[PDB]
Amino acid sequence: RQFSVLHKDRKQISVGLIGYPNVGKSSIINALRGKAVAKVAPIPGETKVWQYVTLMKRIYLIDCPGIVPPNQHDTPEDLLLRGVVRVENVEHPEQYIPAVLRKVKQHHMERTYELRGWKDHIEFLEMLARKSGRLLKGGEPDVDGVAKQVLNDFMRGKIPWFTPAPEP
């Protein structure tokens, strides 16, 4: 409203939302409208095209697909942890489990999955598979599906994790 007052000379203002995939741009637009006007899904890349939503008479909101700026220091593990990609279409998801175990505190994972006593990531996946019945033919653990479940819970706010702010 303050920006609209500052641009009262113009007929309206356009407010475009940008950011990474799955940060909540369409969710923010829906919250501001008070109505589900933009499609919302926890999978990355739900919004594919630019969309105008008339918030008020002089405020338009522009939904945009998420972007990932190319950096030479970014790892595919880093992109998958920041939520760029869908974990169903990646090869060997168990390699990203050590990154999740580094990011998430151990006690948070223990209270999340009611599991304790693993020595490394593949042991954790096997124990959780045997606990949850993720078994293939012959009763072997399904560490691939368990890794996909853990990655999806990490992405969609089911496991607590955050980056602490730098101290002054």
């Binding site: 948070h108 994972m109 209270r111 999340t112 706010g157 089911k158 496991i159 607590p160």
Partner: peptide, 19 residues
């Protein structure tokens, strides 16, 4: 902008946050 008042914001009560 105004004063940032996050005191009345209730965080999400996840499963891992319960003892």
């Amino acid at each position: 902008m105004g004063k940032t008042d996050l005191s009345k914001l209730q965080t999400r009560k996840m499963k891992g946050l319960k003892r």
